Design a protein around this nucleic acid. Structure first.
Lengths: 50, 121, 111, 44, 87
RNA sequence: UGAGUAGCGAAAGACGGGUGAGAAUCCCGUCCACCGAUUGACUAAGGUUUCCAGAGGAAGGCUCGUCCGCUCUGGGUUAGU
RNA sequence: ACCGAUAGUGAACCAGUACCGUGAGGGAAAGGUGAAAAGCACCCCGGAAGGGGAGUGAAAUAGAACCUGAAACCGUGUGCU
């Protein structure tokens, strides 16, 4: 099938309400002092506790 | 099976044999998260075989290991079945299970695949 | 007082860049650097160099401290399009648009 | 699938070459028209 | 006469000059019998053999405009006595 | 606009060491897999420098690319049989 | 009391040219910094492209993708709903 009518900019932007990405999900490393992903090793000094 | 890893039956068994053998040689390798959770069972059941030491245990482990040669030490060469029965199994005589540890790294460029580190405890 | 930096004619589609720009708009400078380094999208390293260039403009050209800074503005604008073709079946060709964007980031001390 | 054009250097010169056009009266008119046009190449 | 145009100074020709061989650029429409008599008349030596070859024009470009280089004819001269046909 | 939608052109890769601003994709090594009346070796037609070395990453390569049949500079084809 | 770059010759510019066809033959698009190159020494982020200052100039939102710079279309921030 082919579209019957042109899609307006109002309808197009409504459809993109939920099209987006999320936050990485990061925590602070208490050896590096810098940010890292949860349950992943630090990348500054390469340490993983626990 | 358990998880098919996007391979046929013959390819899956050949790839687990290659990953398991290379881990004995270097004791620390980097791979994919999904692959690492299936290598666990393969390597850990091979260490159980090397802790028995019988001839039948040796011949049942030669059906999974590959014929590589390790000239890493400065002394005489040895294969990967001599290292499994001689050195690795020597230092696990006390703990019962859990000879492998997995550490997460993160996504890799160009693929987004989760990278992990797998090593012997 | 505000400082700014611009990256011009970046060979990435404009609406793929804008997804990343939505996360760092309004955050502290130290927090925005960490978000960009941990997001696994193609345009994250590109935007990383634009924010770093603007931060260093606030320290040499002006007299501003990089502890009280925030990301004031972050937007993408369209650039020239590169026109290509793709051979389809039955002897027909289809056009391909390789798009381009301009990226601007402004960092403000406040006030 | 076999296509129409199978190249051959000898046939190209013997059918469309300079000496073939000159060896007849209607082929000399072809060369005269391509000089009034200003073409960079006269024959093949 | 002045059949010869220029000498050839390259890596391969340098390895030739260690075994009494000399590489020149000659006129595009001469045979190696004329080249044989031209070398002995100028440098006063005794030639023993001449080998000769041709190269096609190459496609070249600068800016937008495309053209072709000159075609050339190369001669390698073997002597039995004498040397130092250049510095 | 359709829409971040269809597709990305028959197939087995895995790990270690390097280089690098940046590596699933480049170089080296090991194991494994495929053809073998041919995916091997010559060669006529046709194409016309696509051949070699040192450099480069704007565009082309249906992804990436530090790499190339792509870009720059310099080279290479020798007959009395 | 002809045209002023979709006009005027197909061609104001390296045009019967790029390109297309075995061949006869068919055939485009592309003008404009500044009065004067005086075409941005030097510092900072980066591998580079790109940019922020400092200088030239009457003017740099005149920086060679350069006089003026409309509409479609794409974005950021805000008063009322």
């Amino acid at each position: 099938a082919v579209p019957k009518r042109r899609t307006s900019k109002t309808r197009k932007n409504k459809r993109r309400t939920h099209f987006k990405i999320s936050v990485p999900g990061m925590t602070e490393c208490p050896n590096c002092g810098e940010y890292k992903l949860s349950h992943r090793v630090c990348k500054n000094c390469g340490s993983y506790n626990g | 099976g358990y998880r098919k890893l996007g391979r046929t039956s013959d390819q899956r068994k050949a790839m687990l044999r290659d990953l398991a053998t290379s881990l004995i040689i270097s004791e620390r390798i980097e791979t994919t998260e999904a692959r690492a959770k299936e290598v666990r069972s393969v390597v850990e059941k091979l260490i159980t075989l090397g802790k028995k030491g019988d001839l039948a245990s040796r011949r049942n482990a030669a059906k999974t290991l590959r014929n590589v040669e390790i000239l890493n030490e400065d002394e005489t060469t040895q294969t990967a079945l001599q290292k499994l029965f001689g050195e690795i199994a020597e230092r696990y005589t006390e703990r019962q299970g859990g000879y492998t540890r997995i550490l997460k790294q993160g996504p890799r460029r160009g693929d987004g695949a989760e990278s992990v580190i797998i090593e012997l405890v | 007082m505000e400082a700014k930096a611009v990256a011009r004619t970046i060979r990435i589609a404009p609406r793929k860049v804008r997804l990343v720009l939505d996360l760092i708009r309004g955050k502290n400078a130290a927090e925005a650097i960490a978000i960009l380094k941990l997001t696994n999208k193609a345009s994250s390293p590109v935007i990383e160099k634009v924010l770093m260039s603007a931060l260093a403009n606030a320290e040499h050209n002006y007299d501003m401290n990089t502890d009280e800074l925030v990301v004031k503005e972050a937007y993408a604008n369209e650039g020239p399009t590169l026109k290509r073709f793709r051979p389809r079946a039955q002897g027909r060709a289809s056009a391909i648009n390789k798009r381009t964007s301009h990226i601007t980031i402004v960092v403000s001390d406040g006030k | 699938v076999k296509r129409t054009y199978q190249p051959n250097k000898r046939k190209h010169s013997k059918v469309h070459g300079f000496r073939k056009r000159m060896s007849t009266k209607n082929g000399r008119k072809v060369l005269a028209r391509r000089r009034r046009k200003g073409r960079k190449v006269l024959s093949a | 006469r002045d059949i010869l145009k220029r000498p050839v100074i390259t890596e391969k020709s340098s390895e030739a000059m260690a075994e009494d061989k000399y590489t020149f650029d000659v006129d595009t429409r001469v045979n190696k019998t004329q080249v044989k008599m031209a070398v002995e008349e100028i440098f006063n030596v005794k030639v023993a053999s001449v080998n000769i070859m041709n190269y096609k024009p190459k496609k070249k470009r600068m800016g937008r405009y495309q053209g072709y280089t000159n075609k050339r004819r190369k001669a390698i001269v073997t002597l039995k006595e004498g040397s130092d046909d250049l510095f």
